[PDB]
Every structure is written in C-alpha cells, then in structure tokens.
Ligand binder design. Structure first.
Ligand code: NI
Length: 341
C-alpha cells in the first residue's frame, strides 16, 4: 500500500504515488518530475487531477498520453491555491522540469518536499528563505560521507577537453553518449558545441527533448545520424559489443569511438580525482564513466539541512532496510547537534 512518506498530513495530497491504485482519501496527486520510479503507474487511463510543472506536463501529454483535462501545470516561484491549500513549486536542480513543493497547511505548519534534488546555495535565496519549515521530506539518495563528487561544471570541462582533443587528433573519431531518461542533457550538448556538430538521436528521444523548453533546441539536435558527429544511444548499448555494432552501422564514415557513460557515483571517487580518470579500451573503442550527479553529495545535503533547520526530517530514499534508516537517523542527529537547532 502507499507508504507514509508519500502522504502529506492535513491535506488530501500525495506526492509521486501513482502505483498504488486509488489512494484512500487522495484528492490531488502531485508529480515532482518525469522519471519512471516517480511516475510509475501513470498512463492514458488516469482520471484524477495531477499537479506538476509545465515541462513535466508536456511529457505526460506527449509521452504518456495522459488526457489534457487531468494535467494541471503550475508556474514556478508563484503562490498558487490547490483545493484550498497554498502551495509553491521551486526548481529542484535535478532534471528538466523537476520541482520541490512547499505546502502551507491550514493549521500553520509549513512542509517542504524536495522530490529528487541536488542541493545548492542558490536555494538559500528562493521563497524558502521567507519563512520557517517545520517538516522536510528529503531526497536521501547519497546520505553517507563516502559520497563525494565533483561539481557539474568540473565534470563538463573534463568531457569537453577530452572530446575536443580526441577528435582534433583523429577527425574520423565518433563520440557517443549514453542516455536512459531525461536529465544530464548538458553532457551531450556541451560536447556537441565544442565540436560544432548537432546531436543525432532516435525519433522517440528527439520527441522527448522537444518537450523540455530548452531555448534554440532546433539549432542543437537532429534525427539525421549522418550529418552529426555526436550520437546518443540507450545506456544499455554503451559497451564494446554494442559500440562495435553501431560502428558497423555508420558505413565506414568513422574508425574510432570515444564514448561517455554519465554515472551517478562510482567507488573510484574515494581515491581518484576527475583530472585522473581513465577509460576502458578495446581496439579502436574507448569508454569513459564520468560522475555527473543530479543528486546532492553528502556535504551539499548536510549544508542545506543545517541552513533550513527543520523540526522533523522524513527520508524518501534508502528507506527499505533498518540498517539504512538507522545510519541516516545518526547523521541527522550529528547535524542538528553540530549546528544547534
Ligand atoms: Ni529522479
């Protein structure tokens, strides 16, 4: 049944709770972003109201075929009323259209649900600053000290330099970038740009990207593989057999592949620096796994919480084992003691 950490007390609301059938007492279903663990269960046959961002609404309409009459998109940074309750949607710095949700309960309690987020100091100057938050529903994906990773800007720098060098040395080298959901678009767009190319992709993927309100997007992507020297593939195909297969399909236009797998975390981060990353190579094919994260590092998460000083924290990730739960509750206690709230 629907777990308690997906229910917002004092309202008829649930968040990201689309795979439990009809939730007893739910009058509005919020969707934080268009990733499958979160939208799981939505479909063209859904007949309850869905509240979400404009971009997430484009994707529900065009990709899931949810009927328009049930999609209620809201603008960001704007006080809105939903079934009698004031709410605000904030940018979650996750994938395109991802939001956090502020709920202002009738009784005076204020709740922040983060959705999936990558905490950032810039959040400390949104409408969050303007009042106290009593309860926090927190994306705890990387809530452990071993999870360090570099900034997004450092990772992109590394990829840009790597690709530019390889292709300048060998003009017949193809670059391939793996994808399986929205998010991490900067990886392939930044590379394409330094190489003066468009990104070539399948029709389904091109459609997906046309939902995202990315400016000048028509200048940046295409369905014509032949005209483009950065290709996107399913993440499943980013391996030697899969890439060898694809090279055969390009008809002798290229003789080398450089490929990128944007990973979350990988234990090489406990020792090695970004400057010091190396690929896996077989023949004329090389694969880089790069730690481009759209979730908070441990330190980013800790800083956010210590700034916010909530009265209660409810984890939404890693909640399935007692050992995880217990480990997370200890870190929360340390943070609260260290900061004094
Ligand atoms: Ni996500």
């Amino acid at each position: 049944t629907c777990p308690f950490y997906k229910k917002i007390p004092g309202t008829g609301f649930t968040v990201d709770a689309f795979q439990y059938g009809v939730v007893e007492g739910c009058t509005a279903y919020f969707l934080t972003h268009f990733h499958s663990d979160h939208y799981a269960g939505l479909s063209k046959h859904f007949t309850f109201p869905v509240y979400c961002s404009e971009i997430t609404g484009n994707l529900l309409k065009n990709k899931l075929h949810v009927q328009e009459q049930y999609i209620h998109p809201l603008p960001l940074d704007t006080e809105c009323i939903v079934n009698g309750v004031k709410v605000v949607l904030l940018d979650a710095n996750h994938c395109p259209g991802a939001v956090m949700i502020l709920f202002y309960l009738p009784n005076g309690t204020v709740i922040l649900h983060t959705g999936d987020f990558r905490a950032d100091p810039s959040m400390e100057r949104s409408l969050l600053a303007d009042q106290k938050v009593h309860m926090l529903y927190l994306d705890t994906t990387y809530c452990s000290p071993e999870y360090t990773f570099p900034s997004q800007q450092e990772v992109i720098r590394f990829a840009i330099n790597t690709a530019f060098e390889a292709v300048t040395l060998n003009p017949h080298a193809l670059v391939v970038c793996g994808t399986y959901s929205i998010g991490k678009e900067k990886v392939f767009l930044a590379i394409a740009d330094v190489l003066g190319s468009k990104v070539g992709m399948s029709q389904e993927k091109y459609k997906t990207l046309q939902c995202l309100n990315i400016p000048e997007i028509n200048s940046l992507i295409t369905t014509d593989m032949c005209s483009s020297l950065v290709h996107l593939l399913p993440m499943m195909q980013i391996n030697f057999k899969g890439l060898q297969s694809h090279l055969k399909k390009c008809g002798g236009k290229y003789n080398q592949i450089l490929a990128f797998r944007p990973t979350g975390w990988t234990h090489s981060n406990k020792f090695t620096r970004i400057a010091d990353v190396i690929p896996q190579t077989k023949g004329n094919i090389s694969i880089y796994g790069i730690p481009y994260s759209e979730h908070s590092s441990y330190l980013e998460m800790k800083r956010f919480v210590q700034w916010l000083k909530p009265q209660k924290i409810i984890p939404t990730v890693n909640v399935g084992t007692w050992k995880s739960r217990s480990t997370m509750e200890k870190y929360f206690r340390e943070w609260k003691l260290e900061a004094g709230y």
